[PDB]
mmCIF file of C-alpha atoms and ligand atoms in Angstrom:
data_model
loop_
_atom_site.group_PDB
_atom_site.id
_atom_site.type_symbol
_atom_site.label_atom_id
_atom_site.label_comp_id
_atom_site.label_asym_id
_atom_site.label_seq_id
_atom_site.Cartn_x
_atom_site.Cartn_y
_atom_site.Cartn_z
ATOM 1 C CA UNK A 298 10.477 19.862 -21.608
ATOM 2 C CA UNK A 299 9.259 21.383 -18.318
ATOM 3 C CA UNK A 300 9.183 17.932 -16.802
ATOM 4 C CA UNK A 301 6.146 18.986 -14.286
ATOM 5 C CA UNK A 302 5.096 16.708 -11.494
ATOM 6 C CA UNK A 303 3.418 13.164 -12.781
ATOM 7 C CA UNK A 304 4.281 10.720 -10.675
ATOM 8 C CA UNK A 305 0.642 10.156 -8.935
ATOM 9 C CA UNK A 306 -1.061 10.847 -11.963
ATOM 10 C CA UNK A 307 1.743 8.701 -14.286
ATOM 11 C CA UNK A 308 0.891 5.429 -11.828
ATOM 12 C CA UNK A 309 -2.831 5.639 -11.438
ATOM 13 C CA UNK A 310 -2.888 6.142 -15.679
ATOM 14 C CA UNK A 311 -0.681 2.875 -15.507
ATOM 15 C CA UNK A 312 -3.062 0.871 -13.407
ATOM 16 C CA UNK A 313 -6.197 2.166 -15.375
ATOM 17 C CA UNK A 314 -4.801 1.226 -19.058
ATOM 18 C CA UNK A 315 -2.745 -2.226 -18.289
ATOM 19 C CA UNK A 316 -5.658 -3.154 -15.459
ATOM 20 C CA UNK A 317 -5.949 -6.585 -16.916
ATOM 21 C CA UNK A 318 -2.536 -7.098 -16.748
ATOM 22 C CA UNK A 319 -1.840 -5.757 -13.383
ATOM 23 C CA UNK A 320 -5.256 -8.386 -12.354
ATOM 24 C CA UNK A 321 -3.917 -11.412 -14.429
ATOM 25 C CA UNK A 322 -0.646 -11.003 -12.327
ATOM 26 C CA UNK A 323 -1.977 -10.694 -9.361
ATOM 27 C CA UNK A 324 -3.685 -13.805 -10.087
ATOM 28 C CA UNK A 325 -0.340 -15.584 -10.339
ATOM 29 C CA UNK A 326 0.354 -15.102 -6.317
ATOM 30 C CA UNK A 327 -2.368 -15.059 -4.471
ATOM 31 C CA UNK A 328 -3.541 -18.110 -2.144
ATOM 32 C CA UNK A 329 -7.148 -19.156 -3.152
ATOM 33 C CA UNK A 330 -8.548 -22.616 -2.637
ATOM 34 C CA UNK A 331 -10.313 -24.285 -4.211
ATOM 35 C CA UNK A 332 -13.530 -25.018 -2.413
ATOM 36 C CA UNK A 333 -14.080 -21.022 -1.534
ATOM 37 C CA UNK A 334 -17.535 -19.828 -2.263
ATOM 38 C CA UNK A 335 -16.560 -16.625 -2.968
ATOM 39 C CA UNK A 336 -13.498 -17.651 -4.727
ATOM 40 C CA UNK A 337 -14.082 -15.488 -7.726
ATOM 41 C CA UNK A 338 -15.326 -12.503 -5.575
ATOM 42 C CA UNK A 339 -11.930 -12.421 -4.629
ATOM 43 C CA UNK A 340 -11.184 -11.315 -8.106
ATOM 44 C CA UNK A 341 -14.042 -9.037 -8.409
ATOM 45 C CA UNK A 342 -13.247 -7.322 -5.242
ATOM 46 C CA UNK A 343 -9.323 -6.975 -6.495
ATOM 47 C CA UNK A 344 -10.395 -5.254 -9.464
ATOM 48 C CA UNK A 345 -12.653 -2.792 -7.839
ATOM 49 C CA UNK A 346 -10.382 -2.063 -4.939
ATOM 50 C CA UNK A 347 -7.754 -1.243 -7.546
ATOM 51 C CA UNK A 348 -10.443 1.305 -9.105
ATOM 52 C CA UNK A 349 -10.989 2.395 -5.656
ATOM 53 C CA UNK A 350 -6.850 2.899 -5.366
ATOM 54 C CA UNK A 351 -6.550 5.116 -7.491
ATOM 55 C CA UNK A 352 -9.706 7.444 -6.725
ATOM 56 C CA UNK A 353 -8.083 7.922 -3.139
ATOM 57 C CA UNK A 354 -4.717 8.738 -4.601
ATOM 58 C CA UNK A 355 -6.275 11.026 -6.772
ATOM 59 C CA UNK A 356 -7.758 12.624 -3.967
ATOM 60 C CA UNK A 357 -11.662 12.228 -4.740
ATOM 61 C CA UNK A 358 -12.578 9.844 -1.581
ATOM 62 C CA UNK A 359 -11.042 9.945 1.683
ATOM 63 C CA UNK A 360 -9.767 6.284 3.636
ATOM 64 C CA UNK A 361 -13.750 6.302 5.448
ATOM 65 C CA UNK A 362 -14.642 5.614 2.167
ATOM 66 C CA UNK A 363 -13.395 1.927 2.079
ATOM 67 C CA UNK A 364 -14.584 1.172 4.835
ATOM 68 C CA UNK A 365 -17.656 -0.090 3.278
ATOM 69 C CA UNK A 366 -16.141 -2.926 1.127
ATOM 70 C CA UNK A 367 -13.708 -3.740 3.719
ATOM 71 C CA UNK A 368 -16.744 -4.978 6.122
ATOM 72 C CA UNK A 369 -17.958 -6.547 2.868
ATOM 73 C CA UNK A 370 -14.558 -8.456 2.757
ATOM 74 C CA UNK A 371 -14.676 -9.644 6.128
ATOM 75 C CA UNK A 372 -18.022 -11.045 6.037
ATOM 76 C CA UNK A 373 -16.896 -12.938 2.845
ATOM 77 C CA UNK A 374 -13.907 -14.052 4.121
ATOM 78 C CA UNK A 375 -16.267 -15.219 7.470
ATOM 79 C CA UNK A 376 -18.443 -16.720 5.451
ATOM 80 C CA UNK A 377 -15.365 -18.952 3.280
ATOM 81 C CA UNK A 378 -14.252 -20.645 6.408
ATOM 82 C CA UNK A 379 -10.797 -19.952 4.891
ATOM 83 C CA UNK A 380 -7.804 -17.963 7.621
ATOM 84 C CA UNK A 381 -8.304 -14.340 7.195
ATOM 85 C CA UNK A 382 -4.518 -14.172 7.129
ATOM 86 C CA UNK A 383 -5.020 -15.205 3.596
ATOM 87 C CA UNK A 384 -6.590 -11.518 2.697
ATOM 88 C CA UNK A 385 -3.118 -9.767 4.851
ATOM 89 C CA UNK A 386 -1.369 -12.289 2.279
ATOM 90 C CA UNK A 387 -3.316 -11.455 -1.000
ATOM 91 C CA UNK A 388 -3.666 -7.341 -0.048
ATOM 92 C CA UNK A 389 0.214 -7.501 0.334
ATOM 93 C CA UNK A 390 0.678 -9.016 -3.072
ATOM 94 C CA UNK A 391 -1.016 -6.280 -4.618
ATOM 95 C CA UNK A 392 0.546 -4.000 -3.086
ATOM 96 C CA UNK A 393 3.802 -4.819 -3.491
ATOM 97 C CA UNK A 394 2.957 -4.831 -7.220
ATOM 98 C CA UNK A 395 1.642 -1.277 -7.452
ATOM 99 C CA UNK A 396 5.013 -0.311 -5.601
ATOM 100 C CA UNK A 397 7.019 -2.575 -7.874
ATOM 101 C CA UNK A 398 5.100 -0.194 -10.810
ATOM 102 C CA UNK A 399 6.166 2.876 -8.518
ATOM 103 C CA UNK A 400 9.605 2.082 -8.791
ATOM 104 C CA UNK A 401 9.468 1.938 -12.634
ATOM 105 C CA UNK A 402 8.788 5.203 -12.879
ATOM 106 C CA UNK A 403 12.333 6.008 -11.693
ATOM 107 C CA UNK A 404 10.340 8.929 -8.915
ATOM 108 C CA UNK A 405 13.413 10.733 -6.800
ATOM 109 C CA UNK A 406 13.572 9.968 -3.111
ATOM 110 C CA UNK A 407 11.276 13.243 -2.657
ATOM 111 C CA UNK A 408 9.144 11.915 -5.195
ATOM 112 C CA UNK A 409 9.221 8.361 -3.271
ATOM 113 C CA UNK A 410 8.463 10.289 0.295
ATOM 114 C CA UNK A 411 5.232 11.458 -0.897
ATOM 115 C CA UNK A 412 3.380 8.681 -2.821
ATOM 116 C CA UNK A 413 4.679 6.104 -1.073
ATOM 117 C CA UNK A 414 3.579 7.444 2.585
ATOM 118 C CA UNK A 415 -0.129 7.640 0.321
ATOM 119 C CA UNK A 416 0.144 4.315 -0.838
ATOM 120 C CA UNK A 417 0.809 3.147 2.743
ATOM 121 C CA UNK A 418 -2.103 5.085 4.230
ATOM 122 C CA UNK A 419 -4.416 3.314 2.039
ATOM 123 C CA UNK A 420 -3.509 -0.375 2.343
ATOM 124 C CA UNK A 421 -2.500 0.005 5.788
ATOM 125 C CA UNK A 422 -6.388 1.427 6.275
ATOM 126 C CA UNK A 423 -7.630 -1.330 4.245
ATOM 127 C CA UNK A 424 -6.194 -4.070 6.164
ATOM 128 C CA UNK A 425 -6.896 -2.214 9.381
ATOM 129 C CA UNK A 426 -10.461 -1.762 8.764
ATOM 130 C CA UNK A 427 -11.065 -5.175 7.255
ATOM 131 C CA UNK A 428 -9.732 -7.249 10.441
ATOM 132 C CA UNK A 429 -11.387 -4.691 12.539
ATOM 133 C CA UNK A 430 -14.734 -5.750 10.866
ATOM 134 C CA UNK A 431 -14.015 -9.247 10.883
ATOM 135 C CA UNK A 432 -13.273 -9.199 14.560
ATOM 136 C CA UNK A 433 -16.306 -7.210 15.259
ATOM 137 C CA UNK A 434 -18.355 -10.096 13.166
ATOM 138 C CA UNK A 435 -16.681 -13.135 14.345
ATOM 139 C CA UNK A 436 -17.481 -11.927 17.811
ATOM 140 C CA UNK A 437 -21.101 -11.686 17.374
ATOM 141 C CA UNK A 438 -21.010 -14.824 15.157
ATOM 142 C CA UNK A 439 -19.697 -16.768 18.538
ATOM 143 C CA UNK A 440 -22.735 -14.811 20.306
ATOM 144 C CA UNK A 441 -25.534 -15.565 18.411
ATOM 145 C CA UNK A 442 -24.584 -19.755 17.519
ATOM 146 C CA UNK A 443 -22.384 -20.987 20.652
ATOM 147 C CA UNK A 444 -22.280 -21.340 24.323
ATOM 148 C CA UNK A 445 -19.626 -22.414 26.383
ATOM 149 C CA UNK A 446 -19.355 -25.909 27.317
ATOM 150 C CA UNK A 447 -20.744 -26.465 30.467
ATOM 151 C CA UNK A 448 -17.628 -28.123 32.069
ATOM 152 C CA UNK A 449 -16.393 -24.532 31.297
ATOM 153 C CA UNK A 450 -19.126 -22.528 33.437
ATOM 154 C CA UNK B 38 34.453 11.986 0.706
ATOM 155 C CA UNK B 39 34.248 8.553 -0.826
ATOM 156 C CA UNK B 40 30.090 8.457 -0.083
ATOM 157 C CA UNK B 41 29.934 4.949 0.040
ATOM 158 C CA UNK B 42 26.496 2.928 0.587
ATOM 159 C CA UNK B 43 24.725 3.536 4.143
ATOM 160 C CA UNK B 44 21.691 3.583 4.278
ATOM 161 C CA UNK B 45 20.599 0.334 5.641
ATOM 162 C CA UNK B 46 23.834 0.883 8.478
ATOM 163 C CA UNK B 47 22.421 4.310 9.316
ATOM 164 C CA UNK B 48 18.625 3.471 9.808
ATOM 165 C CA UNK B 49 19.794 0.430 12.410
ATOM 166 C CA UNK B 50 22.368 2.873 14.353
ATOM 167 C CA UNK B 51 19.671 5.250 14.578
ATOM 168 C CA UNK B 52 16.857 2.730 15.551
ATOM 169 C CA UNK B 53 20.178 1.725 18.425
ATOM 170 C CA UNK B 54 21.146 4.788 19.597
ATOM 171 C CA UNK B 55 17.826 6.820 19.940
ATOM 172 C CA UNK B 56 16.070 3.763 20.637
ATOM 173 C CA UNK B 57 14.368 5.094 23.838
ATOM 174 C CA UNK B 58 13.161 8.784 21.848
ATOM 175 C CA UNK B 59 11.569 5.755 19.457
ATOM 176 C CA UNK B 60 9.975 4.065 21.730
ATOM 177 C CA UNK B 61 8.560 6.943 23.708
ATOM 178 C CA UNK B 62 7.000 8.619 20.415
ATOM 179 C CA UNK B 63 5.770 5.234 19.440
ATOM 180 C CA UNK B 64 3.892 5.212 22.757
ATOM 181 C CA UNK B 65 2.320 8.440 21.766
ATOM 182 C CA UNK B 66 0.285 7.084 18.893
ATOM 183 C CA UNK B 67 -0.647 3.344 20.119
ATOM 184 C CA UNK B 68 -3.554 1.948 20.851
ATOM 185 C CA UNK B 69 -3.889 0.687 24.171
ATOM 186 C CA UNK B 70 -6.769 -0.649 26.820
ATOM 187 C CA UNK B 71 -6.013 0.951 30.710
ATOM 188 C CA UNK B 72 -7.709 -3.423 31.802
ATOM 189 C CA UNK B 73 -5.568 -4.918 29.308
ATOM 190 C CA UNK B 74 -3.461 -7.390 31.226
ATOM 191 C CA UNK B 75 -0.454 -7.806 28.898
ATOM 192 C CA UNK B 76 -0.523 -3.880 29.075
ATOM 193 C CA UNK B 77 2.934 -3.448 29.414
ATOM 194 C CA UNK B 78 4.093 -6.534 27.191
ATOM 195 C CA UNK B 79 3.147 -4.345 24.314
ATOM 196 C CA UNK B 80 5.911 -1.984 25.110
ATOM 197 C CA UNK B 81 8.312 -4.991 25.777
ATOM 198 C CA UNK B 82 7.316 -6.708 22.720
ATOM 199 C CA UNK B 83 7.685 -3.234 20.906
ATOM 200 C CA UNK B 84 11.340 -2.593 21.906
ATOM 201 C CA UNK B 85 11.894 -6.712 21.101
ATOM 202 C CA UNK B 86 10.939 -6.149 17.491
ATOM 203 C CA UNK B 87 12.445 -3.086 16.929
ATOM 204 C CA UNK B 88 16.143 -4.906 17.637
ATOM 205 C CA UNK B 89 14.403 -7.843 15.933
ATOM 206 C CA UNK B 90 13.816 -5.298 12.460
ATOM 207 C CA UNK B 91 17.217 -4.337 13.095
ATOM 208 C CA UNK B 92 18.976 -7.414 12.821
ATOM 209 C CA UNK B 93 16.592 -8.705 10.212
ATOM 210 C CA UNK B 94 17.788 -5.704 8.034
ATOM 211 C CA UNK B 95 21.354 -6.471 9.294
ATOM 212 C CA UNK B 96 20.838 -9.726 7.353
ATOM 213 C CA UNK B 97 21.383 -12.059 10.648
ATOM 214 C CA UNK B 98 17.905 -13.527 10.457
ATOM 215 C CA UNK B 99 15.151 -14.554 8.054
ATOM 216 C CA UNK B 100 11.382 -13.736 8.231
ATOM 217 C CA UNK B 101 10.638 -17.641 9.522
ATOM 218 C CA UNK B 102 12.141 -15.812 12.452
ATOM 219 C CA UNK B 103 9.652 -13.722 13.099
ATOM 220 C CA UNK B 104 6.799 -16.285 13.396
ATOM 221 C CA UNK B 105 7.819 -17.347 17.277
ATOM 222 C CA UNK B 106 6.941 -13.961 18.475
ATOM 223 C CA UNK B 107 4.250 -13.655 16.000
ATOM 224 C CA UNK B 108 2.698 -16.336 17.656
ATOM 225 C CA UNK B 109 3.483 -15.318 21.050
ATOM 226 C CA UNK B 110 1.558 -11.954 20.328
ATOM 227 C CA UNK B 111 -1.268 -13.561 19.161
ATOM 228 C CA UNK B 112 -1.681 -15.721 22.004
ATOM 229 C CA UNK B 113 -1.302 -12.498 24.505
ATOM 230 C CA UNK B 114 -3.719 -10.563 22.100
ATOM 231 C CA UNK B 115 -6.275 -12.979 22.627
ATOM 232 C CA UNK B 116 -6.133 -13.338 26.183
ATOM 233 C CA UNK B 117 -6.156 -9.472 26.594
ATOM 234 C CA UNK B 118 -9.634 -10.338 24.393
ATOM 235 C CA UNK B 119 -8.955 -6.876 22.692
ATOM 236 C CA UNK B 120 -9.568 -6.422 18.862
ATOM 237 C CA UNK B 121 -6.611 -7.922 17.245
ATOM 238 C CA UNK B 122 -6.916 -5.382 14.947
ATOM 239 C CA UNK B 123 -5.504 -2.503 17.491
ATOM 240 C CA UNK B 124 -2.139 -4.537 16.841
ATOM 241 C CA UNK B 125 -2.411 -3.660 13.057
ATOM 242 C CA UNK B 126 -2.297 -0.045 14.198
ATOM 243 C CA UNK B 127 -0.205 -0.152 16.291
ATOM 244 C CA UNK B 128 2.270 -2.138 14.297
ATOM 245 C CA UNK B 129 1.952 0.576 11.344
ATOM 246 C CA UNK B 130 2.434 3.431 13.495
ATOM 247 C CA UNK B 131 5.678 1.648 14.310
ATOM 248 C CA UNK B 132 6.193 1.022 10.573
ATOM 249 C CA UNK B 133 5.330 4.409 9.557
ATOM 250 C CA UNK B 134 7.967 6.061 12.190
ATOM 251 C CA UNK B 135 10.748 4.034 10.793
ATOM 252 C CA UNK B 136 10.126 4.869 7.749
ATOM 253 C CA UNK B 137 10.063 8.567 8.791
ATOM 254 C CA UNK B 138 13.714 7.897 10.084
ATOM 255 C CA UNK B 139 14.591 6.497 6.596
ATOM 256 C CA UNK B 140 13.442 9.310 4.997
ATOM 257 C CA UNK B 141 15.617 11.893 7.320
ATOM 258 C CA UNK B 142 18.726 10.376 5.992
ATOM 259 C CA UNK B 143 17.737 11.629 2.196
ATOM 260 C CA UNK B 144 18.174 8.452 0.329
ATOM 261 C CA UNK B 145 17.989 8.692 -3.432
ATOM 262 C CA UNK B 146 15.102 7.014 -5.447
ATOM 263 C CA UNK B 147 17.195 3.568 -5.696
ATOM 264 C CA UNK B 148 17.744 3.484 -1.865
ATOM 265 C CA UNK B 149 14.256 3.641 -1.403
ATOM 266 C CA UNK B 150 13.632 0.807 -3.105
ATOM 267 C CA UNK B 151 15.984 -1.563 -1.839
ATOM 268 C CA UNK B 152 15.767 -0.538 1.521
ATOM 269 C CA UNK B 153 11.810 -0.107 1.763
ATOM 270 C CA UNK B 154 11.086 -3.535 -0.346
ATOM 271 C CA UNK B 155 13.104 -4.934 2.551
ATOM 272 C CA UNK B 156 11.014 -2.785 5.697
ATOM 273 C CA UNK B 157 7.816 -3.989 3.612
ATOM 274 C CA UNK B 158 8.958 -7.851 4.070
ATOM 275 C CA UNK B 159 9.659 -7.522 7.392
ATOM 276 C CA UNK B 160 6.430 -5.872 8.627
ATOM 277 C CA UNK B 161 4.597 -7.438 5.814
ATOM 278 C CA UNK B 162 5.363 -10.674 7.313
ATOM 279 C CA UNK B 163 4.699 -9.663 11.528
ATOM 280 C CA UNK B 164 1.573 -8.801 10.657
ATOM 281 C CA UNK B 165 0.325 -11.648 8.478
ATOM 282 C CA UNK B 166 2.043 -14.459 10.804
ATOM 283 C CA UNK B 167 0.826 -12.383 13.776
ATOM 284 C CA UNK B 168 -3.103 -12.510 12.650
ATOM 285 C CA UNK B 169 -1.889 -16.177 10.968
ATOM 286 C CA UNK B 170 -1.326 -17.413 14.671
ATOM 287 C CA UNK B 171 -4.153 -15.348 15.816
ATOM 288 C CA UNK B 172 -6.619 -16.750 13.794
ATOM 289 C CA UNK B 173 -6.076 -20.815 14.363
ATOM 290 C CA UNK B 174 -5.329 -20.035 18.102
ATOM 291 C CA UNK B 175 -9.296 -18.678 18.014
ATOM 292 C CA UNK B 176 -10.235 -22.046 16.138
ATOM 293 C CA UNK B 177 -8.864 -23.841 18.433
ATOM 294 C CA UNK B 178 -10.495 -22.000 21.398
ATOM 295 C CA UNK B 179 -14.023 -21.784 19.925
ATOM 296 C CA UNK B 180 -13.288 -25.940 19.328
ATOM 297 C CA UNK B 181 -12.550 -26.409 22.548
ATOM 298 C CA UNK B 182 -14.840 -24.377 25.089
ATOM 299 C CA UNK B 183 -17.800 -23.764 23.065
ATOM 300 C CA UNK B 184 -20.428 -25.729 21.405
ATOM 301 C CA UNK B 185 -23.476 -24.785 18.989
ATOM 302 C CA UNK B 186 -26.701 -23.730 20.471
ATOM 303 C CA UNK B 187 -28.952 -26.813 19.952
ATOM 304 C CA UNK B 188 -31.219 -24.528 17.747
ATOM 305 C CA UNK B 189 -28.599 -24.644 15.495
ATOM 306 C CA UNK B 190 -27.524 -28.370 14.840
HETATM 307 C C1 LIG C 530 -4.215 -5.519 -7.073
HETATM 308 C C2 LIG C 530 -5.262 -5.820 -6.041
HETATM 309 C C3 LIG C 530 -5.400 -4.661 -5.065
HETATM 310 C C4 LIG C 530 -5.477 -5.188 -3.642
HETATM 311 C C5 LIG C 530 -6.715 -6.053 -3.442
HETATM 312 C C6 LIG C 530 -6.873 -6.406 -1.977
HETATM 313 C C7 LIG C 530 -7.487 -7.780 -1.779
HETATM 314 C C8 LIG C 530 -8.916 -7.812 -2.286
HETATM 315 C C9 LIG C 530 -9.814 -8.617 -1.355
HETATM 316 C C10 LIG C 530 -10.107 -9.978 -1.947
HETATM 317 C C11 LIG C 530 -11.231 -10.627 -1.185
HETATM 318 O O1 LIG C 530 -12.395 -10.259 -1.385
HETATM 319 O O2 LIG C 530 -10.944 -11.516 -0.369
HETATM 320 C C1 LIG C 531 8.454 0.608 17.039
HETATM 321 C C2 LIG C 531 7.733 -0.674 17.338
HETATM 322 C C3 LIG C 531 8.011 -1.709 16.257
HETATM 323 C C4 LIG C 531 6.720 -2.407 15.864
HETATM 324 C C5 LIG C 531 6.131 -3.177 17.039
HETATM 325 C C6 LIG C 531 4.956 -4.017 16.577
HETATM 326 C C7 LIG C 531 3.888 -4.149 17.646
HETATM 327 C C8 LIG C 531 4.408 -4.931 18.837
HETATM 328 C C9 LIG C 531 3.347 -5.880 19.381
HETATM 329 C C10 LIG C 531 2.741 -5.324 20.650
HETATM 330 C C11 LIG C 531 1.940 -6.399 21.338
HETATM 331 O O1 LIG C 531 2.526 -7.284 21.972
HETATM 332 O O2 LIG C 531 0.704 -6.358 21.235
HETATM 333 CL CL1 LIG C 532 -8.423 -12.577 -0.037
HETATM 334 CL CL1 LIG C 533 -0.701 -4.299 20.063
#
């Protein structure tokens, strides 16, 4: 065969056809508890930023484009009382199974350079942009409810 | 020649011995605040953690290792009262230029994944025990200097 270049298009086919198995083991190492409101959001929002994945890698949105659902993280994540280290944590996980899925592949160090460098813009923008948000709300969130104690002023 | 495995030896030497060319391109692409008053501590923790990568890759320390200055960070971050997020960036524009380096010594398809699994641990874990620290350090600040407006309770 010609053996023509696949290797983006080979992974993103992966993670569309074995989605729910990518999801269900994804589910096996991520830190939820128990009492989170959102708790199966988490989930939803794994699923469709996997979706979301791929559409950058194949080129059809650009990394302003999840910026969007990464303020809709944060205000979850706000709103769940739970650290927002626990996203850094759960982001990574996926991550480091869509790289593990990379490897599979058996891509040459060339091949390597150029998806991985992609796959690092993307989740390196989406954990950028989602603790940028969640700064930006937990900032005005100590605005609008608190003051300082007045042995403080 | 007998070609035998480098590329793990070569990335630290290189990270050694052009250590101040790093640095200085690093400072090129960082995020930083002219009124920030741990200004230059971001430099100084930048060239810590770049021998700290180094002997991490080395083998001579574990990620728990990591958490001390993780923690310090955080505390320094918060006092600056910058968006903790600007340490994201500027952590994966640190990231990203090592892994430029990596890529300049040609490693083969395998080498990239034993060697960039490992540089994804390492900065995997600075940035979640950085943001880890950062965020409980906040809880304990809003718990101790502010209170809810009485509209609220
Ligand atoms: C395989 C999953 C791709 C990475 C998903 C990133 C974390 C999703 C955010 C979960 C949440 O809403 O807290
Ligand atoms: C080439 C630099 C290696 C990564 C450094 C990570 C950021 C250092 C933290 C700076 C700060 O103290 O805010
Ligand atoms: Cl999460
Ligand atoms: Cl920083």
């Amino acid at each position: 065969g010609s053996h023509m270049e696949a290797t983006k298009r080979y992974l993103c086919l992966y993670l569309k056809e074995s989605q729910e198995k990518f999801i269900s083991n994804w589910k096996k190492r991520i830190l939820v508890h128990e009492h989170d409101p959102y708790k199966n959001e988490i989930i939803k929002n794994g699923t469709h930023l996997l979706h979301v994945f791929t559409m950058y890698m194949r080129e059809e949105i650009n990394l302003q484009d999840i910026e969007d659902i990464s303020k809709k993280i944060a205000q979850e994540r706000m709103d769940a009382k739970v650290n927002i280290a626990d996203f850094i944590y759960n982001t990574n996980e996926g991550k480091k199974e869509i790289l593990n899925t990379l490897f599979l592949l058996n891509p040459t160090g060339q091949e390597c350079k150029v998806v991985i460098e992609q796959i690092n813009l993307f989740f390196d923008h989406l954990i950028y942009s989602t603790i940028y948000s969640y700064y930006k709300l937990k900032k005005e969130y100590i605005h609008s409810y608190y003051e300082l104690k007045k042995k403080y002023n």
